[PDB]
Amino acid sequence: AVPFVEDWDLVQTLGEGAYGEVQLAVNRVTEEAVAVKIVDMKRAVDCPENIKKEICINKMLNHENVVKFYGHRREGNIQYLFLEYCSGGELFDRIEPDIGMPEPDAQRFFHQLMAGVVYLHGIGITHRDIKPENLLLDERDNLKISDFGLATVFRYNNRERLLNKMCGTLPYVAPELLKRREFHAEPVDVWSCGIVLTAMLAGELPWDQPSDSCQEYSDWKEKKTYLNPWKKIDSAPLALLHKILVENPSARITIPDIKKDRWYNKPLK
Numbered sequence: 001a002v003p004f005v006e007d008w009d010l011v012q013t014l015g016e017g018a019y020g021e022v023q024l025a026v027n028r029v030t031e032e033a034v035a036v037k038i039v040d041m042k043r044a045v046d047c048p049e050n051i052k053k054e055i056c057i058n059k060m061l062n063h064e065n066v067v068k069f070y071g072h073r074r075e076g077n078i079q080y081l082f083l084e085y086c087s088g089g090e091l092f093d094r095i096e097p098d099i100g101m102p103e104p105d106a107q108r109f110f111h112q113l114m115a116g117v118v119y120l121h122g123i124g125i126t127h128r129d130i131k132p133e134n135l136l137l138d139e140r141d142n143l144k145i146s147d148f149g150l151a152t153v154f155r156y157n158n159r160e161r162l163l164n165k166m167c168g169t170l171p172y173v174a175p176e177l178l179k180r181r182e183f184h185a186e187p188v189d190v191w192s193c194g195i196v197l198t199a200m201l202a203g204e205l206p207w208d209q210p211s212d213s214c215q216e217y218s219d220w221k222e223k224k225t226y227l228n229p230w231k232k233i234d235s236a237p238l239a240l241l242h243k244i245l246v247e248n249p250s251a252r253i254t255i256p257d258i259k260k261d262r263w264y265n266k267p268l269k
């Protein structure tokens with residue numbers, strides 16, 4: 001990227017994954033900032049096909065609560081993806097450990113998260129890695145869904161398909177990924193949104209994983225909401241969490257019903 005780096009200063013690393021890093025690029029003349037995701041395709045034999053899929057998915061996106069994708073180019077074995085710079089950073093860094101954030105803030109971010117997820121689901125895309133590290137903020141603190149490296153199509157025109165890949169970040173993963181051979185895509189993203197809401201409200205993830213061998217998950221199935229993180233959560237958002245974090249995905253609340261929830265619609269301070 002020799003001509004590009006002559007005109008653009010790769011000022012600093014914004015973040016990192018396993019595939020590579022995200023850099024802040026600032027044009028020396030215009031001072032325009034863009035984020036550059038740099039991926040070494042030699043990290044895995046299937047990395048060229050996976051990055052092709054991420055770019056393909058990125059090209060389909062156009063929504064106020066999704067990070068804008070500008071383009072990409074390959075230079076040898078390195079892939080460069082150019083994205084809208086989200087100067088508010090990760091939602092993760094608005095979460096005070098063991099505290100969370102004010103309830104009106106968490107509600108506003110949750111509404112924006114639902115708008116982004118409704119959009120993705122409406123075009124038949126599932127994110128599969130919703131977590132505060134993958135939710136960015138722009139200069140006005142509007143939430144933007146980011147990192148589509150695990151995203152896939154679950155509906156072709158008006159025909160759904162089930163998914164079977166165990167992927168995502170384990171404390172955010174729905175229990176059906178650990179119990180069913182195949183499962184519907186939408187309830188999985190609904191579940192991870194519920195874990196994000198829990199983290200925003202109490203600054204703590206509730207369990208290592210929603211599995212049989214996890215005591216913290218058994219505690220939640222047993223309605224022990226007098227234990228952390230639940231005891232830090234007001235009854236109104238907790239009632240919504242009781243509908244989202246439902247073990248059976250067919251009984252789990254859908255996004256149209258989340259939009260009808262009392263706390264979701266609650267006028268806060």
Ligand SMILES: NC(=O)c1cnc(N[C@H]2CCCNC2)c2cc(-c3cccc(F)c3)sc12
Pocket residue numbers: 014015016017022035067083084085086087088089090133134136146147
């Ligand atoms: N498109 C982007 O702008 C972008 C993309 N990826 C990022 N990081 C990854 C790391 C792995 C997990 N997913 C997010 C970040 C971090 C950013 C940031 C951080 C601190 C302050 C600040 F103002 C901005 S911006 C940005």
